[PDB]
Scaffold this active site. Structure first.
Site: not given
Ligand SMILES: COc1cc(O)cc(CCc2ccccc2O)c1
Ligand SMILES: [Yb+3]
Length: 606
Positions: A268, A292-293, A296, A315, A372, A380
């Site tokens: 987004e 979804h985009e 945001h 999300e 990551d 979500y």
């Molecule tokens: C693509 O955006 C993201 C990249 C990342 O490396 C990590 C995140 C969010 C991480 C995260 C936050 C809250 C609950 C679960 C979770 O995996 C989002």
């Protein structure tokens, strides 16, 4: 405090604005330039600050026209290296200075993919792109790499003159390079304060065509016609998102269709959403990603999560708006159908992680956890489920949308936490505090596994999918003759995909049923990326050798992590293909997006 960041927190100083003047060098796979940060102090007697950095080479730091002292800390894994700047004169509270840091990116920058010409559609020119969510903006430039801080910015970007540059900002004009006539400088202004995870760059042979009064579609020439058709309902979706969100404050809304190695369905980026070319199904069937985009633009870009422990705020409210858009366009029964599928995908994430596993909590604690690595469908769908439950409990869609608009209005241009959300939900629903105390909040917010309650779902469009799936699963050899291509005749592509989702939940199946399913449904012919992915997963999980090259072929030719990682995973598990799946990763590791490459190597235990 933002645990995933090593910069001085917002309670100390705050970046107000970034001026970046840089140059994209394809021979060295580097960005070189200066990041002038306008930093306000939040304390008395401030003499130093720390910025986030990752694999950046720092040449020098200049405040007041003179080079100041600075030190790079030792690397802290995925977090990178802290960069302390000794300030030359101590700042009082609210004093503002300008810091101009001369930097260079490394070619291994985790925020960028450097595409050779053969990796593009055109085959003549190279391409580069960025993904800064979650904490990769420090891989491009030193910054307070936390969503607890919002800033405006401007940029000037020098690129091969034959190439084109776009960013997440109003395009502010193009000129040839005064210093180098073989290059062009393109300029960009972003007047709306944004957190730095939304800084975005793409440099390539791009063409544009207009698809609405505030939308141009960007891609390589080979992709423009198809992209303009596939995303032609964006203006219609915007009008709905504005009617639900409140005014769109970003001006433009352009769409950039990236090459296939792009790791997400969408990103987004203000004024220039990035989308996967796997959305090009030929029929606008995957338009919900655009919704979804677009959503945001309010929930995310205007109301931002203070830290990544609260990503669900991003999300979940967005998925709530996106299905509301989809509900307007196609009916309330369609919204419930998408909602129910959503709970379906939540089942699988909890099955996959394990029902007591920490990444299944709505609010995570990301101390010492690469974001990551934690990224999943949980925030979500659990976020969506919570909001759906709350809708039903609090008086239905019209009322909960009143809360949702007020929520954007209330927290626009800010970075919030879960208590800021829940406190406001409580102030808004003053007259329903008894209803709210009935909700089990520790569970929904902090317990792992499935939500403690499931909301009521209309089943109308779903019942046909469940029927056909159960017919296949309870079939014995002597029933398989009765399956026929007229089994699908009253099925939308969506119900079809839901049929495969239902079936895949019970995988495996006998080789014979799969064989037969191909025989009468010709799934193999389908090019819709959602359908194909699940059909291929179903085939591999059911041990069908013929599907190895197809599933392989899908795992590499595109690079959307939602599809790529489970495909390599399934293939790793299947004895017949395990060794080709490892060897194919290792053949393509170099040429892969760095984050995708990282997660698949760990997934594959290389
Ligand atoms: C693509 O955006 C993201 C990249 C990342 O490396 C990590 C995140 C969010 C991480 C995260 C936050 C809250 C609950 C679960 C979770 O995996 C989002
Ligand atoms: Yb039988």
């Amino acid at each position: 405090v933002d645990t995933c960041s090593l910069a001085s927190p917002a309670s100390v100083c705050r970046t107000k604005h970034l001026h970046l003047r840089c140059s994209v060098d394809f021979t060295r796979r580097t960005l070189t330039g200066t990041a002038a940060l306008t930093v306000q102090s939040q304390e008395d007697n401030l003499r130093s600050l720390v910025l986030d950095t990752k694999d950046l080479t720092i040449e020098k730091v200049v405040i007041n026209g003179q080079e100041v002292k600075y030190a790079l800390g030792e690397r802290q894994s995925y977090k990178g290296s802290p960069m302390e700047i000794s300030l030359p004169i101590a700042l009082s509270k609210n004093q503002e200075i300008v810091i101009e840091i001369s930097f260079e990116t490394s070619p291994k920058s985790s925020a960028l993919q450097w595409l050779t010409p053969e990796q593009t559609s055109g085959k003549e020119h190279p391409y580069l792109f960025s993904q800064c969510q979650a904490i990769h903006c420090r891989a491009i430039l030193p910054c307070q790499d936390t969503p607890s801080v919002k800033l405006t910015y401007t940029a000037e970007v020098s690129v091969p003159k034959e190439l084109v540059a776009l960013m997440s900002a109003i395009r502010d004009g193009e000129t040839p390079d005064p210093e180098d006539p073989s290059r062009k400088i393109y300029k960009f202004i972003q007047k709306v304060p944004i957190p730095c995870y939304l800084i975005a760059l793409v440099v390539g042979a791009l063409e544009s065509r207009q698809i609405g009064p505030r939308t141009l579609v960007w891609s390589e020439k080979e992709q423009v016609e198809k992209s303009a058709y596939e995303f032609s309902e964006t203006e219609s979706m915007l009008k709905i998102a504005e009617d639900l969100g409140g005014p769109y404050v970003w001006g433009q809304y352009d769409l950039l269709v990236l090459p296939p190695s792009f790791p997400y369905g969408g990103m987004e980026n203000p004024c220039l959403t990035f989308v996967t070319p796997t959305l090009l199904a030929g029929d606008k069937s995957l338009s919900n990603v655009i919704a979804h985009e677009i959503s945001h633009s309010w929930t995310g870009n205007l109301v931002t999560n203070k830290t990544w422990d609260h990503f669900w705020l991003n999300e979940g409210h967005t998925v709530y708006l996106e299905r509301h858009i989809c509900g307007r366009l196609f009916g309330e029964k369609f919204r419930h159908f998408n909602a129910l599928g959503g709970w379906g995908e939540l089942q699988n994430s909890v099955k996959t992680f394990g029902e007591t596993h920490p990444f299944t909590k709505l609010v995570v604690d990301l101390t010492d956890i690469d974001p990551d690595v934690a990224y999943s469908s949980v925030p979500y769908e659990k976020g969506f489920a919570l909001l759906f439950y709350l809708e039903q409990l609090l008086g239905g869609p019209e009322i909960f949308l009143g809360f949702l608009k007020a929520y954007v209005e209330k927290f626009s241009y800010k970075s919030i936490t879960t208590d800021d959300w829940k406190d406001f939900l409580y102030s808004y629903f003053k007259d329903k505090v008894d209803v709210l105390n009935q909700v089990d909040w520790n569970a929904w917010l902090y317990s792992p596994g499935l939500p403690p309650i499931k909301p009521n779902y209309d089943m109308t469009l779903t019942n046909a999918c469940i029927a056909l799936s159960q017919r296949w699963i309870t079939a014995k050899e002597d029933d398989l003759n009765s399956f026929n291509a007229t089994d699908l005749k009253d099925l939308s592509s969506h119900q079809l995909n839901e049929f495969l989702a239902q079936t895949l939940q019970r995988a495996p199946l006998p080789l014979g049923h799969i064989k037969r399913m191909q025989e009468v449904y010709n799934f193999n012919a389908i090019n819709n990326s959602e359908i194909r992915f699940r059909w291929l997963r179903l085939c591999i999980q059911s041990k069908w050798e013929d599907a190895i090259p197809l599933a392989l072929k899908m795992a590499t030719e595109q690079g959307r992590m939602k599809f790529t990682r489970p495909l390599f995973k399934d293939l790793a598990a299947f004895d017949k293909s395990h060794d080709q799946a490892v060897r194919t990763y290792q053949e393509h590791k170099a040429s892969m997006h760095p984050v995708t490459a990282m997660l698949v190597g760990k997934d594959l235990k290389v």
